[PDB]
Amino acid sequence: MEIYEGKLTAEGLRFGIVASRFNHALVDRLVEGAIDCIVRHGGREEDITLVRVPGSWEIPVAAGELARKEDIDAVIAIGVLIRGATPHFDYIASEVSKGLANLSLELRKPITFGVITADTLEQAIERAGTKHGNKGWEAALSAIEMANLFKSLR
Template sequence: MATSLKNLSDYNSDQLPDISGKRFGIVVAEWNKTITDALCKGAYETLLTHGAKPENIHRNTVPGSFELTLGSQYMAMSNEIDAVIALGVVIKGETKHDDYICHAVAKGLTDVALKFNKPVIFGLVTTNDEQQALDRAGGKHGNKGVEAAVTAIQMLALHS
């Protein structure tokens, strides 16, 4: 569904499980830091809202979105992490660079999730311009970080 038709921060919390004993890794790209920090804040606050303990939420920073895959693998390797949330931004430019990055990150995060048999959530904002990214990082379309955190919680419920 197109983001313009749905607010990323809207969700039904009725069926979310208790996550007070779960441990989360959040991997955040530094590139487009203002946006990725807003995504991380949304994810972090959502996890706290639903019962995660601050000491059970671990953040790692990677240089850019391409590095989210390896950063997520480092987190997923740990038995101390139950789910990983990868957050980044890719804004379309004058070349096809965005296509290559988005495809690599999507494939890489899927591979990490399957390799370690735990949720690794694709929280990559992919837009045509910076304003669209801001709109999805707490702006008029909500916060993709919130959506990613809720997705992690829902995926943990599947394996309980």
Template sequence: MASDLKNLSVFSTDELPDVSHHRFAILVSEWNTEVTEALFDGAYKTLLEHGAKPENVIRGNVPGSYELTLASQWFAQRDDIDAIIALGCVIQGETKHNDYINHAVAQGLTNVSLKTGKPVIFGVLTPNDQQQAIDRAGGKHGNKGDEAAITAIKMIGLQQQVYSKF
């Protein structure tokens, strides 16, 4: 569903797993910092609201969204990290750079997740303009950071379900 029809900060929190003992890495692009800082704030607060401990949330900064892939791989290779949340914002410009970057990042994060078996969450905004980005980073459409954090929590829960012995 298009985010202009849905608030990114409204989601089901039924049956969320206990994440108090899980460790999260939140990777934040420094490009479009006004937006990515708001995404980080949303993700961090949502993790804490749902049981993550502050000392179990590690932040890593990368220069731009393209670098989220390699940084995600580095964190996913750590035994003490359970999920990675990659946050960025690539705004459509006058060239097609956003198409190449967004595709590379989406594919790269998917590959890291499949390679490591850990949830790597795509929290990258792909708006047409700055206002759309602001609207999705705590504005009228909610915060993609909130949604990314809940997705990480739910994926940890699903992973526990899949690998638990009945």
């Protein structure tokens, strides 16, 4: 039986991070977590490209630009969505997730989904550094592992 799996060492890997600006206070914590993960797993900060976009709606189109660069091994998508009074939340989150997934399949490159979709502000605060750990860190781990995996798998 052949086993393919990725180590959690980030030596030599190049990363791209797309972070929305809306929900500024929490997206900053998520980005801090992602950079901390990449650096403390052996990666250099000089090998990280950070792209700032106004809202979550533009994360897919910015990730399309980063992910087609040859010198990028994986892309981390970071954003915070909190449900409001209107159904706007549903139609934004669905399109963001769908675009990211379609892009990842199209470009044959791991694009990791580190976007928080919370019903309440309190949940988003939990998932961005407090009791539940930040999805920035979780997404960075996923991206590192897939970047290592695809080196063997390709």
